[PDB]
Amino acid sequence: LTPVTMDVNYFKIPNNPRGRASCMLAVDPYDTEAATKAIYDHREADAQT
């Protein structure tokens, strides 16, 4: 499911379908805290947007 207001431009380029990017080659290696903050914590901004 997806909110009615989701940005159409999100679908015009290859993006993560879950709405938040977790291309974990960018996150620091072996840093579980940083990886979980990147994937879930919404008090910090997304990546690639």
Binding site: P14, L25, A26, D28
Partner: protein, 49 residues
Amino acid sequence: VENATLARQALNRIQRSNILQSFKAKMLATLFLLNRTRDRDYVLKFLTR
């Protein structure tokens, strides 16, 4: 091989971010090589690379 000469240490966040960008672009550029292009010069360059 293209990013070979920049990193002389464990990759900085910016360096591996550039590596990830190159990964994605080069993956999408050549995913099905012979189907999309059939120039003799281009295929020769791809093979020599």
